[PDB]
Ligand binder design. Structure first.
Ligand SMILES: CC(C)C[C@@H](N)C(=O)N[C@@H](Cc1ccccc1)C(=O)NCc1ccc(F)cc1
Ligand SMILES: CC(C)C[C@@H](N)C(=O)N[C@@H](Cc1ccccc1)C(=O)NCc1ccc(F)cc1
Lengths: 10, 96, 131
């Protein structure tokens, strides 16, 4: 869980 | 008029003691505050996630619950504190 | 979210939208697994509402979204509507979500996990951007 395939960019 | 596209925002967590300076006795143990940093959750964000990265994984720390009636960015939003509710989640999933 | 920013499409894969039968977004939620969504008890979800997963732009017709029906609504018995305490509801899906690059689960914390004041975290959603 908790590891997006598409990385969030903050 | 909610936006069409998904929005995001980073914000700091506050302690319940400090949050009480804003909300008084409305702050209970199963609540966690965040914000008062120039951004704010608002109507329509309810139920959504407040996540913090722990050991590389995004973990659900809060659920958008309530806050300023005007979504004031200088007032902290209040979220349901997941650590205080996870035992119930685990029980419900294991029984249904 | 007031003063937020548009997210990279699909980067918050657990984020779902709760929409009524008319297509009106009224609340957000998070997928904790293929069959369960966690949201706020005050959202007042019924079995006639729909869980939309994999969505980014609610005005787009070309997104391959998943419209999931809700089988049961589990409002925490400790929820107190007067004080808004224990504001959590679990929704068991009738049809399981299909995990993919844009749809997956967020982790749950251990009851003893500590998240210190000052820590910078993230909140997402389709709530008002201006009040
Ligand atoms: C005591 C509440 C009525 C206070 C109200 N300002 C509020 O935040 N209401 C909730 C809705 C609600 C109804 C019934 C019980 C509990 C809550 C809301 O708008 N929640 C969404 C939200 C989140 C953060 C904000 F800063 C502003 C609005
Ligand atoms: C109901 C459980 C099956 C939920 C499970 N998907 C989950 O969120 N697991 C957490 C741990 C947990 C277990 C049971 C109840 C609540 C939380 C996890 O893997 N969290 C991420 C993580 C990463 C590295 C570690 F060393 C430990 C945990």
């Amino acid at each position: 869980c908790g590891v997006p395939a598409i990385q969030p960019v903050l | 008029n909610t936006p069409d596209r998904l929005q995001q925002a980073s914000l700091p967590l506050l302690s319940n003691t400090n949050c009480k300076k804003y909300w008084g006795t409305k702050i209970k143990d199963a609540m966690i505050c965040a914000g008062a940093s120039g951004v704010s959750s608002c109507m329509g964000d309810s139920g959504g996630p407040l996540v913090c990265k722990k050991n590389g994984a995004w973990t659900l720390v809060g659920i958008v619950s309530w806050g300023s009636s005007t979504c004031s960015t200088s007032t902290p939003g209040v979220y349901a504190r997941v650590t205080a509710l996870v035992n119930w989640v685990q029980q419900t999933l294991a029984a249904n | 979210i007031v003063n937020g920013e548009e997210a990279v499409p699909g980067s918050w894969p657990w984020q779902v939208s709760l929409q009524d039968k008319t297509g009106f977004h009224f609340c957000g939620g998070s997928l904790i697994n293929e069959n369960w969504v966690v949201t706020a008890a005050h959202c007042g979800v019924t079995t006639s509402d729909v869980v939309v997963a994999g969505e980014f732009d609610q005005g787009s017709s070309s997104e391959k979204i998943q419209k999931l029906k809700i089988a049961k609504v589990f409002k925490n018995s400790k929820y107190n509507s007067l004080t808004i305490n224990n504001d959590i509801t679990l929704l068991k899906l009738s049809t399981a979500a299909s995990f993919s690059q844009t749809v997956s689960a967020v982790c749950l914390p251990s009851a003893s996990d500590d998240f210190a004041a000052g820590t910078t975290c993230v909140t997402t959603g389709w709530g008002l951007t201006r009040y």
